Design a protein around this ligand. Sequence first.
Ligand SMILES: Nc1ncnc2c1ncn2[C@@H]1O[C@H](COP(=O)(O)OP(=O)(O)OP(O)(O)=S)[C@@H](O)[C@H]1O
Ligand SMILES: Nc1nc2c(ncn2[C@@H]2O[C@H](COP(=O)(O)OP(=O)(O)O)[C@@H](O)[C@H]2O)c(=O)[nH]1
Ligand SMILES: [Mg+2]
Ligand code: NA
Lengths: 394, 204
Amino acid sequence: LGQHERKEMLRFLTCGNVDDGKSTLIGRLLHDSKMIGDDLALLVDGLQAITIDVAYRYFSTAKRKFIIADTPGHEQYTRNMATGASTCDLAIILVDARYGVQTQTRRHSYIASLLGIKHIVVAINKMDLNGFDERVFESIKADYLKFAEGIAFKPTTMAFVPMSALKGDNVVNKSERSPWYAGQSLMEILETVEIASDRNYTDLRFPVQYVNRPNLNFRGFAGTLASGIVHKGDEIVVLPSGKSSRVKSIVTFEGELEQAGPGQAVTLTMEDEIDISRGDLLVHADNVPQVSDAFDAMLVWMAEEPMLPGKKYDIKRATSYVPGSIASITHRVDVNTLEEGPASSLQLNEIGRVKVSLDAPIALDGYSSNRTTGAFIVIDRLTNGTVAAGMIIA
Amino acid sequence: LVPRGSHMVDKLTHLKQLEAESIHIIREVAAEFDNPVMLYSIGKDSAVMLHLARKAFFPGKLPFPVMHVDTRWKFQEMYRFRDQMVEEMGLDLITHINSAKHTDIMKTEGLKQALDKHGFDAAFGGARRDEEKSRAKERVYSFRDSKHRWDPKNQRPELWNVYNGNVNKGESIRVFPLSNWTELDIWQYIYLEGIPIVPLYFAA
Ligand SMILES: Nc1ncnc2c1ncn2[C@@H]1O[C@H](COP(=O)(O)OP(=O)(O)OP(O)(O)=S)[C@@H](O)[C@H]1O
Ligand SMILES: Nc1nc2c(ncn2[C@@H]2O[C@H](COP(=O)(O)OP(=O)(O)O)[C@@H](O)[C@H]2O)c(=O)[nH]1
Ligand SMILES: [Mg+2]
Ligand code: NA
């Protein structure tokens, strides 16, 4: 009460294989966040007790709100981890202290990095078993960093925590079992990591979602700010066509705002009767992204049915909906080994660089520049299913 | 020219972020579906959802009607609250009427029958993922077929805040705007927004 009114929201992903200790870890987190008595036991039990499913877990502190995205670590559930990773701010890459970096460690890291997770914490678990051997910790940290170096995997924060999910060491409170550890505990990271990772305060992207026309004289353009800051009187342009207008008003239920930032559900009114439909992007006139009908992209294929170049699909970017096809597959990335390989097909759970072609041009951004306007889904025209997750390279 | 910084706008708190995310979902459905309905209980979660729906369309009214699946009888203070709510907001409320047996015939079948009579293809439910254990693997969009059943392969992965609403003729969905909210989030939202609530303070 009182302090719980102004908190942030952090979504984080949990990555690891059978018996790494993630049911124990999650159970420990969900439990010790409530202790401001082994009930923990029943929590861990419940969590231990072919699907597209992602498990979403909820808990909070006084500092912030947490959503845990839980997904199994087996290759077969890559699409599942991809789905979960898409909204996450941070990933907990969980390793067993005796085994160190494995193929699943490499695979989960790639998926997290691919889906734009800017914060990873390597949770080196079961350190209680090796007697909190610093040598083991340093060994695992170094060869994970060596792996990270060979991906250009440069997230904004990378932390290595020696812990015991079972015993609680460095999970919530710092451990006396590791005097050689100067870093912060998990939870201390989870509460303090800056989530100004939505870097896009610099470039306005407003995907037009809904044309609100209540009466004949109010014409509003509703949606969510993907990036940048819009200000009353800003000179904007739509990116379908290139034509310009000035922002008359920023309209919300609370009233009229002078400015609005990323992640805000607003409605924009315009000074000129400019023609704006759902699917168009509204942008700053002095800062305009490329507009094209062809682009490179990473694809996470997630349908049982294979992907065939030339076959018509529907591309839903954000609010931009345009039919098209993949012209060619540049390569398919083997998720286990992280190397390029030629292909003429993409199977279930497969990832590759593709050449995309659309029937009409959209405004575009590299997914690494913009998490919204660089992200898209591939939709089958006959089955209506969401068959692939796409992220633009530019 | 130097770009604008975050120090200019008030940073998104958890409730504001949840608010925006739920507004976005409501707008998408409205944007893609012909005949949506907001399934409105007379309870606390549906009150938050209805408040979100208003925020989603200001200064317009709801482009969709609101529905209440009426049983034999609920608390007397609920009927009186909801009746006044319709008159005080110029709302379009549809009532429908035709705990093991009771709930099955009146709610489950009633709601099923209500959707068919009007021809709705999308339905807003205020259910939350933290309310029951199973809800953890639930998605925002829940795809139902013509005869109304749920099929696993017809369900679609929900990637960012991009949602796939492509549906066939006679097929309908269930939308859960509040799925990311917790019990604490809702009350905290009710308190800060001053959302009117039924005098009884125990989950209806
Ligand atoms: N009889 C009904 N008529 C219309 N919508 C309903 C009905 N029952 C449930 N719903 C919808 O389905 C969701 C599930 O209901 P509940 O879990 O009981 O939440 P609530 O009734 O809004 O709040 P409570 O009961 O005070 S915790 C609600 O958000 C309603 O929008
Ligand atoms: N000694 C030790 N045991 C652990 C640790 N974490 C988990 N375990 C044990 O490993 C077993 C499997 O853990 P679990 O959380 O179910 O792994 P999961 O399959 O990833 O969910 C259980 O008996 C746990 O008690 C740890 O840090 N140290
Ligand atoms: Mg109720
Ligand atoms: Na409820």
